[PDB]
Coordinates of N, CA and C in Angstrom, one line a residue:
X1 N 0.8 -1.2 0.0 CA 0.0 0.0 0.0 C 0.9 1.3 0.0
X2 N 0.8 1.9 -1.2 CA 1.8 3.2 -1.5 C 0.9 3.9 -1.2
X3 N 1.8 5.0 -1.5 CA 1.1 6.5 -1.4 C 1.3 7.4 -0.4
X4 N 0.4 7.9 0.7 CA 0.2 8.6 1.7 C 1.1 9.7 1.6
X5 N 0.8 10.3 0.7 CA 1.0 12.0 0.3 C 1.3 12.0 -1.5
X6 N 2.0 12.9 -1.7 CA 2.1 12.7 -3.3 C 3.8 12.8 -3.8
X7 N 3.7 12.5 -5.2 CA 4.6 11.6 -5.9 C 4.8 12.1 -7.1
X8 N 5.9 11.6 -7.9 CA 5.7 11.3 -9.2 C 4.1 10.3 -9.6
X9 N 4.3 9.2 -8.8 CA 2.9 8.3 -9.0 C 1.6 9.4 -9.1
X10 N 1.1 10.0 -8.1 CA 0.5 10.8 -8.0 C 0.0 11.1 -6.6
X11 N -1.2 10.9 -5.9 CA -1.8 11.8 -4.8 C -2.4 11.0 -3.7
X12 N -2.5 11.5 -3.1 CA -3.3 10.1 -2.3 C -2.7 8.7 -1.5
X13 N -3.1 8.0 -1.9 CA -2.9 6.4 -1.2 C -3.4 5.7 -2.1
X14 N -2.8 4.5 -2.2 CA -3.1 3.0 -2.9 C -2.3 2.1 -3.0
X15 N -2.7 1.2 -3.3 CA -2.3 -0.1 -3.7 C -1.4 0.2 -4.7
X16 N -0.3 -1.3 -5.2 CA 0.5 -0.9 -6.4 C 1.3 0.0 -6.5
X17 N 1.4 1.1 -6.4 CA 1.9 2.6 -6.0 C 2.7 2.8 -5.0

């Protein structure tokens, strides 16, 4: 579970990421 702020990936939180 990626995420928890933002990224290149992008925003947010999720899975995969």
């Amino acid at each position: 579970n990626a995420x928890x702020x933002x990224x290149t990936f992008x925003x947010x939180x999720g899975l995969x990421x």
